[PDB]
Amino acid sequence: SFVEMVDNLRGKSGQGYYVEMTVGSPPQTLNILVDTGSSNFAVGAAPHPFLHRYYQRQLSSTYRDLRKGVYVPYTQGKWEGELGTDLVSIPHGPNVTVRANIAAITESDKFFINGSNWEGILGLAYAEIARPDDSLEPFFDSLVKQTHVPNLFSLQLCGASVGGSMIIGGIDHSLYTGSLWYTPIRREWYYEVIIVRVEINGQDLKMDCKEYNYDKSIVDSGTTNLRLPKKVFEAAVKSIKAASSTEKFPDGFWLGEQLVCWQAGTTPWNIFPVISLYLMGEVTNQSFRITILPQQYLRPVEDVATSQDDCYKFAISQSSTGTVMGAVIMEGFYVVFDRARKRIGFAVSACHVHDEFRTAAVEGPFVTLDMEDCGYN
Numbered sequence: 081s082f083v084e085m086v087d088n089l090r091g092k093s094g095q096g097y098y099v100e101m102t103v104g105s106p107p108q109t110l111n112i113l114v115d116t117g118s119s120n121f122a123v124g125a126a127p128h129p130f131l132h133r134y135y136q137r138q139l140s141s142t143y144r145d146l147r148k149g150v151y152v153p154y155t156q157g158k159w160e161g162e163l164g165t166d167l168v169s170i171p172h173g174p175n176v177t178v179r180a181n182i183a184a185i186t187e188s189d190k191f192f193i194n195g196s197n198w199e200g201i202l203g204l205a206y207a208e209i210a211r212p213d214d215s216l217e218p219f220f221d222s223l224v225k226q227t228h229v230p231n232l233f234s235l236q237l238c239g240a241s242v243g244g245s246m247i248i249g250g251i252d253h254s255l256y257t258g259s260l261w262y263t264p265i266r267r268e269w270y271y272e273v274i275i276v277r278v279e280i281n282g283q284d285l286k287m288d289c290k291e292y293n294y295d296k297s298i299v300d301s302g303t304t305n306l307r308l309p310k311k312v313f314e315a316a317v318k319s320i321k322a323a324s325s326t327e328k329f330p331d332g333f334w335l336g337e338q339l340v341c342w343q344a345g346t347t348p349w350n351i352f353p354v355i356s357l358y359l360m361g362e363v364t365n366q367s368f369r370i371t372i373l374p375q376q377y378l379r380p381v382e383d384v385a386t387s388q389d390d391c392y393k394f395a396i397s398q399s400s401t402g403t404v405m406g407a408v409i410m411e412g413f414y415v416v417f418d419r420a421r422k423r424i425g426f427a428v429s430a431c432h433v434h435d436e437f438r439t440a441a442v443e444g445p446f447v448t449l450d451m452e453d454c455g456y457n
């Protein structure tokens with residue numbers, strides 16, 4: 081019954097994927113960012129230079145004020161607002177209506193993005209990281225509690241405008257090929273997983289696998305980049321530099337500051353390596369790997385000059401809060417957030433990344449010893 085939800089996501093490259101939602105009675109329509117890296121449902125509720133519309137509580141007869149304030153800090157952006165509840169629907173989703181907590185955003189700093197076409201954010205992670213505390217029930221928990229929608233969703237994010245699907249309540253098997261491979265959700269707060277091995281062009285990075293998950297690894301549709309802990313980032317960039325040393329790149333390209341360009345249609349894909357992330361599996365001593373192409377971590381950006389060249393930003397960057405498996409990792413895969421069984425599944429997406437000689441993949445089974453040692457404590 082999921083066909084109604086296929087292709088219910090839109091966005092601009094690097095500016096997030098959003099789904100259409102209605103809040104209030106009568107329904108007010110808003111585009112809402114889909115974010116598995118946070119747990120608050122919040123909407124613009126006051127004018128802002130980057131908002132074309134916003135939630136007007138006064139016009140909703142079903143609005144209820146919770147008389148508590150709230151703030152959520154993200155990596156760089158932040159907002160504060162007033163908590164309340166209201167009726168919410170998803171037009172291209174399940175045919176249900178829920179009373180959900182809504183943070184009405186009244187003030188913000190570097191949160192809304194100019195031209196992103198979304199006006200709010202839907203945090204799909206667990207209550208443990210909700211603000212102000214874990215008693216503010218997240219949207220998806222409300223949806224499951226108040227309806228019969230099964231306790232899972234899946235995200236199919238497609239690359240180069242962007243689109244995709246959020247299948248709410250199940251798995252749509254026409255959106256992927258091959259088998260689904262599942263990794264345990266290590267803890268219900270972020271969607272935390274355990275990376276047990278990293279390979280670049282087939283060569284093991286040969287680090288203590290604890291380094292990969294220091295201090296955690298998460299699956300985050302609300303972040304563009306693959307973000308890596310400092311030691312892992314340095315090892316990965318060194319190795320990526322070595323593979324592509326045929327060409328010289330500005331020192332600021334590797335830091336995400338300067339873009340690189342080539343004559344349109346001459347991007348030298350073959351000099352950049354594939355990256356394989358091995359994830360903890362479902363059975364003892366078993367893992368699986370997902371393989372990432374340079375077409376995923378070299379993100380296309382608009383040509384800032386007058387050239388008709390292809391230009392790219394390096395979409396692997398350094399982190400101090402653990403690994404983030406962001407949108408560039410998720411693009412091309414069908415990712416199943418199986419909350420009911422505490423696991424996350426990966427499969428090759430119908431919109432998977434295409435090279436002539438290489439292909440993004442999800443492969444298993446593999447044997448990996450002492451996977452338990454890879455978690456950080």
Ligand SMILES: COCc1cc2cc(c1)C(=O)N[C@H]([C@H](O)[C@H]1CO[C@@H](COC)CN1)Cc1cccc(c1)OCCCCN2
Pocket residue numbers: 094095096113115116117118153154155156157190191192193300302303304305307397
């Ligand atoms: C590389 O660093 C900078 C950076 C880049 C991007 C997103 C974030 C940060 C970000 O903050 N994402 C947020 C995501 O909840 C994270 C935040 O830090 C962690 C959670 O803490 C609560 C991990 N989950 C969600 C978010 C917020 C504001 C704007 C966004 C997304 O716009 C989406 C388009 C841009 C995506 N790219």
